[PDB]
Amino acid sequence: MTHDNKLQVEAIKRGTVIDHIPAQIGFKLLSLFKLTETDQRITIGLNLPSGEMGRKDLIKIENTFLSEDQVDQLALYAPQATVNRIDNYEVVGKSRPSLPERIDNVLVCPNSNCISHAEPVSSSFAVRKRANDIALKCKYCEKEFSHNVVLAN
Amino acid sequence: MTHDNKLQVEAIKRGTVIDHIPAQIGFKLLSLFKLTETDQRITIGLNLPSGEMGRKDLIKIENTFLSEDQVDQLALYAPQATVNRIDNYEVVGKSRPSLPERIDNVLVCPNSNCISHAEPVSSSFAVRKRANDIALKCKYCEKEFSHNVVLAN
Amino acid sequence: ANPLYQKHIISINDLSRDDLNLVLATAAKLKANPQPELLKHKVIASCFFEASTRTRLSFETSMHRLGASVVGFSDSANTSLGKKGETLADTISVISTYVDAIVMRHPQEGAARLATEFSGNVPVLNAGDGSNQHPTQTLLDLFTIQETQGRLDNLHVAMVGDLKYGRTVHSLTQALAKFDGNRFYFIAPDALAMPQYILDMLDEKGIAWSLHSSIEEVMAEVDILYMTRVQKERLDPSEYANVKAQFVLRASDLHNAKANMKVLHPLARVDEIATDVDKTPHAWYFQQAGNGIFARQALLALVLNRDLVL
Amino acid sequence: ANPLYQKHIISINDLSRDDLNLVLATAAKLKANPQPELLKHKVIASCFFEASTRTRLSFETSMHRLGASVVGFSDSANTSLGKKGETLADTISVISTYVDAIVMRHPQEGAARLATEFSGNVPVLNAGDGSNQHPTQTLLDLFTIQETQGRLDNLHVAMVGDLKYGRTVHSLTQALAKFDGNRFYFIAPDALAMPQYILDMLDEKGIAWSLHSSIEEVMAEVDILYMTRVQKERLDPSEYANVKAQFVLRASDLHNAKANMKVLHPLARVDEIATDVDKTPHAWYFQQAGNGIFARQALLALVLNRDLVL
Amino acid sequence: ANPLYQKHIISINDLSRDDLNLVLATAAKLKANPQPELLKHKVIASCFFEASTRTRLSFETSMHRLGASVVGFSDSANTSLGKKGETLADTISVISTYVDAIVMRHPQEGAARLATEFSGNVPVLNAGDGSNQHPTQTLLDLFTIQETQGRLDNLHVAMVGDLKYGRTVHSLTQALAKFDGNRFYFIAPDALAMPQYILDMLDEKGIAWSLHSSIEEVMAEVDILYMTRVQKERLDPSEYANVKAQFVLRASDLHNAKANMKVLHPLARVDEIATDVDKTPHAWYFQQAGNGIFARQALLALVLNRDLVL
Ligand SMILES: O=C(O)C[C@H](NC(=O)CP(=O)(O)O)C(=O)O
Ligand SMILES: O=C(O)C[C@H](NC(=O)CP(=O)(O)O)C(=O)O
Ligand SMILES: O=C(O)C[C@H](NC(=O)CP(=O)(O)O)C(=O)O
Ligand SMILES: [Zn+2]
Ligand SMILES: [Zn+2]
């Protein structure tokens, strides 16, 4: 029980409530983590205001909790985002995300000549917080890339 | 406009509201007509149960109006869905999709040899209630396909 | 101005029964009394991005038979569209500013229609857009049928060959489904069946049609035996099974043929029509060809000349 | 078991200084003390999906100098991969059920790595995967540097030519960074510079390296002058500008060099080393190639042999 | 001398049950008891006039596992047949004067047979002649079935894919008809059905076989599910309609199968077996391939060796 204010959010008994999603990154996380499979209520607040951070997206899926590496997967796409695990209308589990050591099968190597494209294998990337441009290393071609180059979406 | 099962916070002055979008359809329509591509406050509620319609969808879109034509574009997915006209928290007038005569853009002609793909020209399909389904006719190549095969973007 | 003045002739679905009548009439009228200066001073484009012998040469002769001038290309291999990466839209953009009318054959369905969106006020004549329509072919076929059956209503038409890609059967059929009493017979291999949109349309107008396994099932009761080539060049590689002709009209099978029954074929023909049929009185394909001059002269006089050429 | 028993030799980044040192010390021993039967009864697949003369022939020659057998293909066009469209994964799988070790050279990066995943317990050796790595090249290089300069520490190595697509110079730097006191002079046309990932590591390592517009400047300062060939087969068309060796070596520029410096090159050499260089006591590309024999013999003995008294 | 001493292994139709059984029993013995010197001093020509990875490499690997030597060509383009226009008859003649046994794979049917006629006393082994036979494939298949089902009698074998041009399924049926109680389920697209000659023999033999439109029906009823690849290189253009695997296997359809059934495939596999199948305990195509090693080793020992104590 409680009531986070400033603007209008939605009621939830138990379930994950992801808050602080950057602008328009909502419609993305919605499909990048295929959240629309859940046949359970899904609240979604787009362009809501937020102090010095103005408009912010916000997704809410009662009775659903992010899979293990999901929050880790949710680091590259929204660094400042916050995961709130709810139960009994309570924030029983506040969690901030950390960039993991490696991203499996979701990313796609930029090297055209990388054997991963052709052959049947799960792409795997080493995550190196190279100062400020997340460094991404391809497990196969050993090439390294600027996280954004790898990150089209 | 009162409504209460679980106390909440869900109101708006102006804007439009597509209510009665049948389950799942709400996400599709999000991309197709690009209703999300705005700085304007949006509030989607996928899978939110209500009445005898039970599982539905609902998109409160702040300070945004659609046209007769625009609303008609929705008939191809959310017919019984009905665009409701908000404004000043007052319900100006409940609209509702009606079969549009032509689907400009969005769709992509399935014929591989159609001039549309190559040339810089917006698609266009003649919509038509064909027997059991809804047949579509390319303006250009003149091929008619069942709405259940023609794609988009 | 007459009904077809400055209008685009993209598809037989756009013209009305009356419009067809005006062409066949003017065609007959023009056949009787040539008018060598009717288009004197005009410059028309013959633009063919796809192989052609009859359609082009006949269209070009027509233009010459009225004093029109011609300019164009036999094949895109040497147009900037071809060697310099250029859109068809830009090609037609620039060309519509030189000539008075554009005639074009293209490999993709919808090219002519496209043209009608950058040709400005200059009209476009669809000489064949992929497997879609071949609208002037129809005018000639009609002109010919009427010439040999006396009418265009209450006829029996057997269409053999490739009806799927056969643009001549698409136009022609939507054309004959505008008159009354014409019953159709479709004889084609399942993979090259007549497209659904034409059958929905036949059903709609209450028109009757029927499939058959062979010409025999229609030979003694068809007035028009429209034979067609197999569109080898458009066939999906998944359908190469039907590359060679499944039905060969040999002169012998015209043994129980109705007297007025004629055999038509837009050409070119491969092996579907044996050369001995060339000697039976039903064979009318080359007469068919020759008629192209009249239907085509007719159409250009109607689109480029405000007043009915008399 | 020894350190590299049954291990995959995929990339220098995966080996350690001691690992490297074990190869050379071993190589040294095989070089002066033959072992005709060491690999008797072993069957080694020599799978080259890309051109080769030195790498394939040296390797197979080694297999033979140890009593081992070789089965293989020097063209992926006659396999069932390049004909029946089989995936490499399936090719590596079936083959790993026949042989004892697989030697592989492939067109794309990560190809060796991927095989380790489908080869079960069969050690895979990377004869070169795209423009990523070429480990055995480096083992033969380290040995040549060591036997001529008596040290792998505090050297002055200059690398010239295509440093971007050069898999040989990627494997060599990561190796020479394992040792102490090495200073790297990088001489390449900008479109073909050393990748950033390799440099970042040199920095992380605290290693001195510099850029230069010509050998002239570092010439009387280097110990090793590693020359490379422009990887023509890999350049993108936008890079086609560099297909001509921009920095070429003639006997003339070897004038002020240290009387101990050697000129190495993985070969083949296009036109980057003028033949006159071949007679100067500095040219060491052919003795270097000769060393591939002892380096690979050592690697094969170590990967397939547990204990090894020599 | 033993039963297959110096004999040609041209077609399963020429071997007998006992013959087959001698191979497997032998294979069984070689599989658990190596013979490094059994073929010492023998020189075997591996002549492949058509693509290969498993058949050629397994065979040559076997030659080596027995102390034999291999001379050969993996491309007929570099021979004097594909250049100087020599006949195969002349090629088989000169070669039969150098080697002890010839292994051959050829583009056309009857190629192996023809060689027996010009090879003098040199035994010829058919690594595959067109789309006729592939005997060694069947020996390795019979062994895999036997070692997993413990019997070659009363089995339930379903054959799927290109049954017409599949040389592997021609050799396998004629084999399994030699045993008792086998029931065959044939699942193929009509243009690629089992040839009539093979069926006539099944009938003559009094053997139960049936046709089916999908695995679904026989799935929970088979012991062996032999999958095959559409022989793309052999299809006539009219058949090009079938170049896409029409019946594909996913882990999902293996749900009600007998917990003892195995899925075999000669490979390479195009897209007829989804990868998820690879992890089910039913997938046995890679262990099957592994067996080619012991099957061919046995065949070679038997053909070249008179008496053989093991
Ligand atoms: O080509 C055919 O088979 C029929 C038809 N042919 C013609 O119109 C005559 P041409 O192709 O010589 O101009 C067409 O569709 O182009
Ligand atoms: O190709 C080069 O020039 C460098 C290097 N060269 C070699 O390995 C020699 P080879 O191609 O004769 O085996 C390589 O990576 O292939
Ligand atoms: O080719 C096939 O798919 C079946 C069968 N396959 C094999 O023998 C395997 P390979 O072509 O790798 O030697 C054949 O007859 O070649
Ligand atoms: Zn990569
Ligand atoms: Zn179209």
Coordinates of C-alpha atoms in Angstrom, one line a residue, chain C:
Chain C
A1 CA -14.6 17.0 -76.9
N2 CA -15.3 13.3 -77.6
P3 CA -15.5 10.9 -74.5
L4 CA -11.9 9.5 -74.7
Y5 CA -10.2 12.8 -75.3
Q6 CA -6.9 13.3 -73.5
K7 CA -7.7 10.4 -71.2
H8 CA -5.2 7.7 -70.1
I9 CA -5.9 4.1 -71.5
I10 CA -4.4 2.1 -68.5
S11 CA -6.9 -0.7 -68.1
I12 CA -10.1 -2.3 -69.5
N13 CA -11.6 -2.0 -66.0
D14 CA -11.5 1.8 -66.4
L15 CA -13.4 2.0 -69.7
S16 CA -17.1 1.6 -70.1
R17 CA -19.0 -0.6 -72.6
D18 CA -19.8 2.6 -74.5
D19 CA -16.1 3.6 -74.7
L20 CA -15.3 0.3 -76.2
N21 CA -18.1 0.9 -78.7
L22 CA -16.7 4.3 -79.7
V23 CA -13.3 2.7 -80.5
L24 CA -14.6 -0.2 -82.6
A25 CA -16.9 2.4 -84.4
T26 CA -14.1 4.9 -85.0
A27 CA -11.9 2.0 -86.0
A28 CA -14.3 0.8 -88.7
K29 CA -14.8 4.4 -89.7
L30 CA -11.1 4.9 -90.0
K31 CA -10.6 1.7 -91.9
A32 CA -13.0 2.9 -94.6
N33 CA -11.5 6.4 -95.0
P34 CA -7.8 7.1 -94.0
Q35 CA -7.0 10.5 -92.6
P36 CA -3.1 10.9 -93.2
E37 CA -3.0 14.3 -91.5
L38 CA -5.2 13.7 -88.5
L39 CA -2.2 13.8 -86.1
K40 CA 0.0 15.9 -88.3
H41 CA 2.2 18.0 -86.0
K42 CA 2.1 15.6 -83.0
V43 CA 5.1 13.8 -81.5
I44 CA 4.4 10.5 -79.7
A45 CA 6.7 8.4 -77.6
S46 CA 7.1 4.7 -78.3
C47 CA 8.7 3.5 -75.0
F48 CA 9.2 -0.2 -74.7
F49 CA 11.1 -1.6 -71.7
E50 CA 10.1 -5.0 -72.7
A51 CA 10.3 -7.1 -75.8
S52 CA 7.6 -6.5 -78.5
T53 CA 7.0 -6.9 -82.3
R54 CA 3.3 -6.4 -83.1
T55 CA 2.2 -4.0 -80.5
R56 CA 5.1 -1.7 -81.1
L57 CA 5.5 -1.8 -84.9
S58 CA 1.7 -1.6 -85.3
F59 CA 1.4 1.3 -82.8
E60 CA 4.2 3.1 -84.6
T61 CA 2.7 2.5 -88.1
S62 CA -0.6 3.8 -86.8
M63 CA 1.1 7.0 -85.7
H64 CA 2.7 7.3 -89.1
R65 CA -0.6 6.6 -90.9
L66 CA -2.0 9.9 -89.3
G67 CA 1.0 12.2 -89.8
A68 CA 2.2 11.9 -86.2
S69 CA 6.0 11.8 -85.5
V70 CA 7.6 9.1 -83.3
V71 CA 10.5 9.0 -80.9
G72 CA 11.5 6.5 -78.3
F73 CA 13.4 3.3 -77.4
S74 CA 13.1 -0.4 -78.3
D75 CA 14.8 -1.4 -75.0
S76 CA 16.0 0.2 -71.8
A77 CA 19.6 -1.0 -72.2
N78 CA 20.6 2.5 -73.4
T79 CA 18.3 4.9 -71.5
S80 CA 19.7 6.7 -68.5
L81 CA 17.1 4.8 -66.5
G82 CA 19.3 1.8 -67.4
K83 CA 22.9 2.9 -67.1
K84 CA 22.5 5.7 -64.6
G85 CA 20.2 4.4 -61.9
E86 CA 17.1 6.4 -62.6
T87 CA 13.5 6.1 -61.5
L88 CA 10.8 5.4 -64.0
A89 CA 8.9 8.2 -62.3
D90 CA 11.8 10.7 -63.1
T91 CA 12.0 9.2 -66.6
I92 CA 8.3 9.9 -67.3
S93 CA 8.7 13.2 -65.4
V94 CA 11.1 14.5 -68.0
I95 CA 9.6 12.8 -71.1
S96 CA 6.0 14.1 -70.5
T97 CA 7.5 17.6 -71.2
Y98 CA 8.5 16.8 -74.8
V99 CA 5.8 14.7 -76.5
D100 CA 2.1 14.8 -76.8
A101 CA 1.4 11.2 -75.7
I102 CA 3.2 8.2 -74.2
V103 CA 2.9 4.5 -75.2
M104 CA 4.7 2.1 -72.9
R105 CA 5.2 -1.6 -72.2
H106 CA 6.9 -2.5 -69.0
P107 CA 7.8 -5.7 -67.1
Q108 CA 6.2 -4.7 -63.8
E109 CA 2.4 -4.6 -63.2
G110 CA 1.3 -1.0 -62.6
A111 CA 4.0 0.8 -64.6
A112 CA 1.5 2.6 -66.9
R113 CA -0.6 3.7 -63.9
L114 CA 2.5 5.1 -62.3
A115 CA 3.2 7.0 -65.5
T116 CA -0.2 8.6 -65.1
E117 CA 1.2 10.3 -62.0
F118 CA 4.1 12.2 -63.5
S119 CA 3.0 12.6 -67.1
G120 CA 1.4 15.8 -66.2
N121 CA -1.4 16.4 -68.7
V122 CA 0.2 14.3 -71.4
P123 CA -1.8 11.0 -71.7
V124 CA -0.5 7.5 -71.1
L125 CA -1.4 4.4 -73.2
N126 CA -0.7 1.1 -71.5
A127 CA 0.9 -1.2 -74.1
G128 CA 1.2 -4.0 -71.5
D129 CA 2.3 -3.8 -67.9
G130 CA 3.7 -7.1 -66.8
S131 CA 0.9 -9.7 -66.3
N132 CA -1.7 -7.1 -65.5
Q133 CA -3.5 -5.5 -68.6
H134 CA -2.9 -5.2 -72.3
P135 CA -5.8 -2.8 -73.0
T136 CA -5.2 -2.0 -76.7
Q137 CA -4.8 -5.7 -77.4
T138 CA -8.4 -6.0 -76.3
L139 CA -9.6 -3.2 -78.6
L140 CA -8.1 -5.1 -81.5
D141 CA -9.5 -8.5 -80.4
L142 CA -12.9 -7.0 -79.9
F143 CA -12.7 -5.2 -83.3
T144 CA -11.9 -8.6 -84.8
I145 CA -14.5 -10.7 -83.0
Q146 CA -17.2 -8.3 -84.0
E147 CA -15.8 -8.3 -87.5
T148 CA -16.2 -12.1 -87.7
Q149 CA -19.2 -13.0 -85.5
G150 CA -21.2 -9.9 -86.3
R151 CA -21.8 -9.3 -82.6
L152 CA -20.2 -9.0 -79.2
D153 CA -23.2 -10.2 -77.1
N154 CA -24.4 -13.8 -76.5
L155 CA -21.1 -15.5 -77.6
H156 CA -19.2 -18.5 -76.3
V157 CA -15.6 -17.9 -75.6
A158 CA -13.0 -20.6 -74.8
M159 CA -9.8 -19.3 -73.4
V160 CA -6.8 -21.7 -73.5
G161 CA -3.2 -21.4 -72.3
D162 CA -1.8 -19.3 -69.5
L163 CA -4.7 -17.4 -68.0
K164 CA -2.7 -16.5 -64.8
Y165 CA -0.1 -14.3 -66.4
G166 CA -1.9 -13.8 -69.7
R167 CA -2.5 -10.1 -69.7
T168 CA -4.5 -10.4 -72.9
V169 CA -7.1 -12.7 -71.2
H170 CA -7.3 -10.3 -68.3
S171 CA -8.3 -7.2 -70.3
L172 CA -10.2 -9.1 -73.0
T173 CA -12.4 -11.0 -70.4
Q174 CA -13.2 -7.9 -68.4
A175 CA -14.1 -6.4 -71.8
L176 CA -16.5 -9.2 -72.9
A177 CA -18.1 -9.2 -69.4
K178 CA -19.5 -5.7 -70.2
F179 CA -21.8 -7.0 -73.0
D180 CA -24.5 -9.6 -72.4
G181 CA -25.0 -13.3 -73.2
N182 CA -21.3 -14.0 -73.5
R183 CA -20.6 -17.4 -71.8
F184 CA -17.0 -18.3 -71.0
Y185 CA -15.0 -21.6 -70.9
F186 CA -11.6 -21.6 -69.2
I187 CA -9.2 -24.3 -70.3
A188 CA -5.8 -24.0 -68.4
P189 CA -3.5 -26.0 -66.2
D190 CA -4.4 -25.5 -62.5
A191 CA -1.1 -23.6 -61.7
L192 CA -1.9 -21.1 -64.5
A193 CA -5.6 -20.7 -63.6
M194 CA -7.5 -17.5 -64.3
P195 CA -6.9 -15.2 -61.3
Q196 CA -9.5 -15.1 -58.5
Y197 CA -10.4 -11.4 -59.0
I198 CA -11.8 -12.1 -62.5
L199 CA -13.9 -15.0 -61.3
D200 CA -15.3 -13.0 -58.4
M201 CA -16.2 -10.5 -61.1
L202 CA -17.8 -13.0 -63.4
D203 CA -19.9 -14.4 -60.6
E204 CA -20.9 -10.8 -59.6
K205 CA -22.3 -9.8 -63.0
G206 CA -24.1 -13.2 -63.0
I207 CA -21.9 -14.2 -66.0
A208 CA -21.4 -18.0 -66.5
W209 CA -18.1 -19.7 -67.0
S210 CA -16.8 -23.3 -66.8
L211 CA -13.6 -25.1 -66.6
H212 CA -12.7 -28.1 -68.9
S213 CA -9.9 -30.6 -69.4
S214 CA -9.7 -30.1 -73.2
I215 CA -10.9 -28.2 -76.2
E216 CA -13.1 -31.1 -77.2
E217 CA -15.5 -30.2 -74.3
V218 CA -16.2 -26.9 -76.1
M219 CA -15.2 -27.2 -79.7
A220 CA -18.6 -27.6 -81.2
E221 CA -20.2 -24.8 -79.2
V222 CA -17.7 -22.0 -79.0
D223 CA -17.7 -19.1 -81.5
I224 CA -14.3 -17.8 -80.3
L225 CA -11.3 -20.0 -79.5
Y226 CA -8.9 -17.5 -78.0
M227 CA -5.6 -19.4 -77.8
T228 CA -2.6 -18.0 -75.8
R229 CA 1.1 -18.5 -75.2
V230 CA 2.6 -19.6 -71.9
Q231 CA 4.2 -16.6 -70.3
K232 CA 7.6 -18.4 -70.0
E233 CA 9.3 -15.2 -69.0
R234 CA 7.1 -14.5 -66.0
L235 CA 6.6 -18.0 -64.6
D236 CA 7.8 -18.6 -61.1
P237 CA 10.7 -21.1 -61.3
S238 CA 8.4 -23.2 -59.0
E239 CA 6.0 -23.6 -62.0
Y240 CA 8.4 -24.6 -64.8
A241 CA 6.5 -27.8 -65.0
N242 CA 4.1 -26.0 -67.4
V243 CA 6.6 -24.4 -69.7
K244 CA 5.6 -26.4 -72.7
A245 CA 2.1 -26.2 -74.2
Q246 CA -0.5 -28.6 -72.6
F247 CA -3.0 -28.0 -75.3
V248 CA -2.1 -28.1 -79.0
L249 CA -4.9 -27.0 -81.5
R250 CA -4.2 -29.3 -84.4
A251 CA -6.1 -28.7 -87.6
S252 CA -7.8 -32.1 -87.1
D253 CA -9.5 -31.1 -83.9
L254 CA -11.4 -28.4 -85.8
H255 CA -13.3 -31.4 -87.1
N256 CA -16.6 -30.7 -85.3
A257 CA -16.0 -26.9 -85.1
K258 CA -18.9 -24.5 -85.6
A259 CA -18.9 -22.8 -89.0
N260 CA -18.4 -19.2 -87.8
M261 CA -15.9 -20.4 -85.2
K262 CA -12.5 -18.7 -85.6
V263 CA -9.3 -19.3 -83.8
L264 CA -7.6 -16.2 -82.3
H265 CA -4.1 -15.8 -80.7
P266 CA -2.4 -12.5 -79.7
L267 CA 0.9 -14.1 -80.5
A268 CA 3.6 -14.9 -80.5
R269 CA 2.7 -18.6 -80.8
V270 CA 5.1 -21.4 -80.0
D271 CA 3.9 -24.9 -80.4
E272 CA 0.3 -24.5 -79.2
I273 CA -1.1 -23.9 -82.6
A274 CA 0.1 -26.4 -85.3
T275 CA 1.0 -24.8 -88.6
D276 CA -1.7 -26.8 -90.5
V277 CA -4.4 -24.9 -88.6
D278 CA -3.0 -22.0 -90.7
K279 CA -4.9 -23.5 -93.6
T280 CA -8.4 -24.1 -92.0
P281 CA -11.0 -21.4 -92.5
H282 CA -11.2 -20.9 -88.8
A283 CA -7.6 -19.6 -88.4
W284 CA -7.8 -15.8 -88.1
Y285 CA -4.7 -14.9 -86.0
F286 CA -2.9 -13.0 -88.8
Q287 CA -6.1 -11.2 -89.8
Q288 CA -6.3 -10.5 -86.1
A289 CA -2.8 -9.0 -86.2
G290 CA -3.6 -6.8 -89.2
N291 CA -6.6 -5.3 -87.4
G292 CA -4.2 -3.8 -84.9
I293 CA -3.7 -0.9 -87.3
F294 CA -7.3 0.1 -87.2
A295 CA -8.0 -0.3 -83.5
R296 CA -4.8 1.5 -82.7
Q297 CA -5.3 4.4 -85.3
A298 CA -8.8 4.7 -83.8
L299 CA -7.6 5.1 -80.2
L300 CA -4.9 7.7 -81.0
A301 CA -7.4 9.9 -82.9
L302 CA -9.8 9.8 -80.0
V303 CA -7.2 10.7 -77.3
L304 CA -5.3 13.4 -79.3
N305 CA -8.2 15.0 -81.3
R306 CA -10.9 16.9 -79.6
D307 CA -13.6 16.2 -82.3
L308 CA -14.8 12.8 -83.6
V309 CA -12.8 12.1 -86.7
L310 CA -15.6 11.6 -89.3

